[PDB]
Amino acid sequence: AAGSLADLLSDNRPLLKDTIGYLDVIQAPLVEQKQEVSDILVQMPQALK
Amino acid sequence: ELANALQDLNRVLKTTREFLDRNGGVLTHDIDNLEQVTTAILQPEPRDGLETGLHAYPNLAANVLNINSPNQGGIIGLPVFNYLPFGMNLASTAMTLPKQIAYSEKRLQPPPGYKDTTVPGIWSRDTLFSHGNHEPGWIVAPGMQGVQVQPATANMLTPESLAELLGGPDIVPP
Amino acid sequence: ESLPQTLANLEIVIDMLKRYNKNVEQVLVALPQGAAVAQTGTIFAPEGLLHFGLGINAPPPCLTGFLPASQWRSPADTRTEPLPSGLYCKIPKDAPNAVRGARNYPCADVPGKRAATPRECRSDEPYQPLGTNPWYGDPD
Amino acid sequence: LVAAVGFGNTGGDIFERGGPYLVRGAQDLLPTSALLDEYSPALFCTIRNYHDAAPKLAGALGGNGYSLLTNSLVVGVGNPYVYPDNLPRVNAKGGPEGRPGCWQPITRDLWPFPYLVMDTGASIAPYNHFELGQPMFAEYVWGRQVGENTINP
Amino acid sequence: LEQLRTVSDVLNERKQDLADILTVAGKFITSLAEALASGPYFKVMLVN
Amino acid sequence: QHFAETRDLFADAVTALGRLSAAADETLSGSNANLHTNLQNLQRPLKQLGRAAPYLVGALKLILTVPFNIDNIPKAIRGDYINVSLKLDLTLSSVDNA
């Protein structure tokens, strides 16, 4: 298990770093506009019906 | 072997302690919320709803893309005992132009001397008498297996490409 | 008791996406062209183009498998009602009318079968139409 | 030692319950990951264009506040879908110019959207000229109609 | 992780709305897409 | 003497760590390369979604229901029937294009 974890980290450290950065940049507008997201999620089912 | 192992074990224990103290509550909260939302959207009725959505939406996308006519813009729709015994359709106006058609995959572009038809990938001959399945020599785009055709459109399709609509190998355009 | 369930649910979702990979690819293809279509059809900002089709009763619409005529509601009532389920045209694939309807949708998981809903794609009970659509009422 | 007993038991039970799920999920994610990677360029421009067309369609809906504003000019419709030739297909792939992507924004200088044909089982590509609808006349008593159904009208 | 936390909070608050979205969109999409099936257009009924 | 007193506890500790590490190793080895391929694939869509993140919330008004806008569904559609305003335009250019 120690070897497997060390290998996984050594292989996926840069990709996980880039994924963390891109998740940050994706989620910053989502957080800054959370009220709009909540409102449209509340609004959609009645419109769909 | 042992000195480096002990030192690195000490350092990783300290780092794990700090990392847990800093991120554990938020990480657990994220896991709990993700579990709750996924369990909510994977209930029986949401499950079959997502099933039908993925089963029947791309057809809707294809048809709503087919309704739009570039020359006139926008969409087209026609008005509608259940109904009258007789029906009529005077003519079909020009929806598109030869200079407006673009092909999703470069394998779908007709070669010289052939024109596209209302079933994608089936290419017909472009002659003056080629209207209403009347000019033989139709060839089929590569990788278009599994499309049934009516006998009338099969007659003009040539035996090789007619077989290709049921058989494996794709024909070679001239 | 949460991380195993999170991983199980993610596995279920990814499995359902994998069994319907072609559908997702088709939708991802159709979306940008849909954006281009909307951009083209909204050149005039307050009013969007929507033409009408000439010709009378070229395909006659089917009333089989839909709500009966006696169950229709007058246009005056803006009151909403619970939308029923399992409503689609029930003709035995005949006629030019509604060729590409629900009943001819490809089943992604089960090759070589076309049915309206995956509940009917998976079910092995044979698909029979509710009836041919007649011109003199009683579509049943 | 006692803390190791507790931690090992708890982690072992967690992994026993949630290891096969993770393994098979990461196995089934490979095709969809490749799918989403292939259609990367059709994401930013698509989101931008839908965002920009959201107010333009919203003004059309809300300019009145009680109905929809549309221009209705009479046009002729194409031939009705025929039974075997026009069955649905879900083999659509690719984008404009053979690769996934978006056009440039549709201004008024360059109005018409270049039509895109995809493996579907239906198209309106050949309608480049005026011709009479092949099922010009029909009957719904004995189903006897004039004209010949075609995919090449 | 914190911005993911607040996003997940606002999404867990509306998980039931998401379930209702999927439930209704799975029970009307087939009936609604039925209209654009007879041809390269969609049928309409004009009661006026 | 102390070790002989706590031999059973040491055995339990080693067996528990082994029970954890067996499942951990099987899960990590069963998904070492699938995870790497999934991440390498998903890196590009993550970058593109980061580019298009600010416009995402606005696009949700239209990207699901494309012909309609969710904001104005209740007022335009009054139940069974959709209210539409018809401009039957018989302009020369409209007929020429039609």
Subunit contact F70:A18, Cβ cutoff 8 A: no
Residue A24 contacts E where some CB pair is shorter than 8 Å: yes
Q: In chain F, which residues have their Cβ closer than 8 Å to the Cβ of A16?
A: 39
Residue of D7, D99, D119, D148 for testing the chain B interface, max B β-carbons within 10 Å: D119
Q: Retrieve residue B131's tokens.
A: 């209207």
CA F21, F23, F26: angle at the middle one, nearest 5? 105
Taking CA atoms, A34 is separated from B30, D10, D66, F61, in Å, by: 16, 36, 29, 14
Q: Which two tokens stand for residue C129?
A: 């139409």
CA dihedral B148, B152, B154, B157 (to 10 degrees): -130
Name which of B106, F55, B105 is nearest D46 in CA terms: F55
Rounded Cα distance, D49 and D53, in Å: 6
Chain Cα centroid distance, residue D2 = 58
In this structure, what are the phi and psi dihedrals at residue B139, rounded to the nearest 5 degrees? Answer: -120, 160
Using CA atoms in the order C34, C36, C40, C43, what is the torsion angle rounded to 10 degrees?
Answer: 100
Between CA E47 and CA D53 the distance in angstroms is: 31
DSSP state of C55: S
Record the tokens describing residue F77, joined without a space. 């559609």
C79 interfacial to chain F (CB closer than 8 Å):
yes
Tokens of C4: 């195993």
Of C75, C80, C81, nearest to F81 by CB-CB distance is C75
D5 lies within 8 A of chain B by CB: no
Task: Among C27, C47, C56, C110, pick the best mutation site for testing chain B contact (most B Cβ within 10 A).
Answer: C56
> What 3-state class would DSSP assign to C50?
strand
Closest to F94 in 3D by CA, of C52, B89, D67, D129:
C52
Q: What is the DSSP letter of E35?
A: G
Q: Inspect the interface and report whether the beta carbons of E38 and D81 lie closer than 8 Å.
A: yes
Q: How far is C-alpha C23 from the geometric centre of its chain's CA atoms? A: 14
- Residues of B whose CB is below 8 A from C51: 69, 72, 74-77
Name D139's Cβ contacts closer than 8 Å, sequence gap at least 6: B85, B86, B87, D145
Question: What span, in angstroms and rounded, lies between the C-alpha atoms of B157 and B149?
Answer: 9
Token reading at D88: 């649905």
Chains B and A touch each other (3 or more Cβ pairs < 8 A):
no
Contact D71, C47 (CB under 8 A): yes
Residue carrying the six token digits 């030192």: B7
Contacts with D57 (C-beta within 8 Å, 6 or more apart), sequence order: C38, C42, C48, F62, F68, F69
With CB atoms and an 8 Å threshold, state whether F32 touches A29.
no
Which of D70, D76, D111 is the closest to B93 by Cβ? D76
Task: Return the closest-CA partner of residue E7 out of A42, A6, A36, A44.
Answer: A36
Q: How far apart are the C-alpha atoms of D135 and C56, rounded to whole Å? A: 12
- On whether the CB atoms of residues D85 and B146 are closer than 8 A, the answer is no
Query: Is beta strand C48-54 parallel, antiparallel or unpaired with respect to D69-72?
Result: parallel
State how far the Cα of B118 lies from the Cα of B65, in Å rounded to an integer. Answer: 14
Chain E hits for D80, Cβ within 8 Å: 38-39
Among residues F71, D68, C90, the alpha carbon closest in space to that of E30 is found at C90
Question: In Å, what is the CA distance from E16 to each residue of A3, A47, B30, C14, E4?
Answer: 43, 16, 17, 21, 19
Beta bridge partners of C52: B77, D74
Nearest by CB to B72, which of F66, F67, F97? F97
Which residues 6+ apart lie within 8 Å of C53 measured at CB?
Answer: B76, B77, B78, B79, D75, D76, D77, E41
Contact E14, B39 (CB under 8 A): no
Give Cα B9 distance to the centre of its chain.
53
Q: Are strands B101-103 and D115-117 parallel, antiparallel or unpaired?
A: parallel
Q: Which residues pair with D72 in a beta bridge?
A: F88
- Which token pair is F24? 């951990």
> Cβ contacts of residue D88 below 8 Å, gap of 6+?
B59, B62, C100, C104, C105, C106, D120, D121, D122
State the Cα torsion F80-F83-F87-F88 to the nearest 10°: 20
**Among E38, E43, E45, the residue to mutate for chain C (most C Cβ within 10 A):** E38
| Residue D30 zone, left/alpha/beta (φ > 0; ψ -120 to 50; rest) | alpha
Decide if A20 touches F, using CB distance below 8 A.
no
Would you give the DSSP letter of residue C64?
T
Output the CA–CA distances (angstroms, integers) from residue A17 to A28, C121, F43, in the order listed: 17, 43, 11
Beta bridge partners of D75: C53
CB half-sphere exposure, B40, CA atoms < 13 A:
18
How far apart CA C95 and CA C89 sit, in angstroms, is 12
Q: Name beta bridge partners: D99.
A: none
- The CA distance from D144 to D151, in Å, is 20
A38 in reach of chain F (CB within 8 A): no
Which residues of chain F lie closer than 8 angstroms to B93, CB-CB? 98
Residue D47 has phi, psi (to 5 degrees) of -65, -45
What is the DSSP-derived secondary structure letter of residue F14? H
* Residue with the two structure tokens 């939708």: C27
Residues B153 and D150: beta-carbon distance below 8 Å? yes
- CA atoms of B51 and B48, how far apart (whole Å): 5
Q: How far apart are CA F2 and CA B90, in angstroms?
A: 102
Which neighbouring-strand residues pair with D69? F85
Contact F70 A44 (CB under 8 A): yes
Q: Which tokens belong to D98? A: 């053979």
Across the interface, of C59, C119, C135, the residue whose CB is closest to B85 is C135
Q: Any idea what DSSP says for residue E46?
A: -
Q: Do E40 and B75 count as a contact with CB atoms less than 8 A apart?
A: no
Distance from CA of E29 to the nearest CA of A (A): 10
* Chain B meets chain D (3+ C-beta pairs below 8 A): yes
- Determine the Cα–Cα distance for residues A36 and F59; give it in Å rounded to an integer: 12
CA dist F9 and F16 (Å) reads 10
Q: Give the closest of E28, E34, E41 to C89, CB-based.
A: E34
Q: How many Å lie between the alpha carbon of F8 and the closest alpha carbon of chain B? A: 25
Comparing alpha-carbon positions, the chain B residue that sits nearest to E44 is B79
Can you tell me the distance from the alpha carbon of C85 to that of C54, in angstroms, rounded to the nearest whole number? 32
CA atoms within a 13 Å half-sphere pointing along the CA-CB vector of B169: 5
Distance between CA atoms of F13 and F23, rounded to whole angstroms?
16
DSSP readout, chain B?
A: -HHHHHHHHHHHHHHHHHHHHHHHHHHHHHHHHHHHHHHHHTSHHHHHHHHHHHHHHHHHHHHHHHH--TTT-SEEEEE---S-SEEE---B-----TTTEEESSGGGSPPTTEEE-SSTTEEEE--TT-SSS-S---EE-TT-TT----HHHHHTT-HHHHHHTTSSSPP---
Q: What angle do CA F45, F46, F52 make, to 5 degrees?
A: 85
Q: Do chains C and D touch (3 or more CB pairs under 8 A)?
A: yes
Please report how many Cα atoms fall inside a 13 Å half-sphere around the Cα of residue F79, on the Cβ side. Answer: 12
- How far does the CA of residue B169 sit from the closest CA of chain D (Å)? 18
- Across-strand partners of B134? none
Bridge-based pairing of strands B122-125 and B139-140 is antiparallel
Cα gap E22→E19, rounded to integer Å: 5
Spell out which residues of chain F touch residue A5, defining contact as CB-CB under 8 Å.
24, 28
Distance in Å, alpha carbon of F39 to nearest chain A alpha carbon: 6
**Neighbour-count burial for C66-101, b at 16+ CB within 10 Å, e otherwise:** beeeeeeeeeeeeeeeeeebebbbbbeeebbbbbbb
Phi-psi region of C65 (alpha: psi -120 to 50; beta: other; left: phi over 0): left
Q: What are the structure tokens assigned to B59, written together?
A: 């057809």
DSSP string, C90-128: ---S-SSTTTTSGGGPBPSSSSS-B-SSHHHHH--S---
Identify the DSSP state of E36.
G
Q: How far apart are CA D50 and CA D69, in angstroms?
A: 20
CA distance D49 to chain B (A): 16
Residue where the block lists tokens 């045209």: C89
Nearest CA in chain D to B141: D119
Q: Chain F residues with CB inside 8 Å of D7's CB?
A: 16, 20
Q: From CA B148, how far away is CA D91, in angstroms rounded?
A: 15
Task: List the single residue in A with minimal CA-CA distance to E11.
Answer: A38
- Phi-psi label, residue B143: left if phi above 0, alpha if psi -120 to 50, beta otherwise: left
Tokens 């993700």, residue located: B34
Side-chain half-sphere exposure of D130, counting CA atoms within 13 A: 7
Three-class DSSP labels, F15-83: HHHHHHHHHHHHHHHCCHHHHHHHHHHHHHHHHHHHHCCCCHHHHCCCCCCCCCCHHHHHHHECCCCEC
Instruction: Quote the DSSP letter at residue D80.
Output: P
Q: What are the helix (H) ranges across chain A?
A: 2-32, 34-48
D77 phi/psi in degrees, rounded to 5: -95, 160
The residue of chain A with its CA nearest to that of F58 is A36
Beta strands in chain D, from DSSP E residues, in sequence order: 69-72, 74-76, 115-117, 137-139
Q: Please name the residues in contact with D2: beta carbons below 8 A apart, sequence gap of 6 or more.
A: F9, F13
Could you give the CA distance from residue D47 to residue C31 in angstroms, rounded to a whole number? 10
Q: Does A44 touch chain E (CB under 8 A)?
A: yes
Determine how many CB atoms are found less than 10 A away from the CB of residue B119: 24
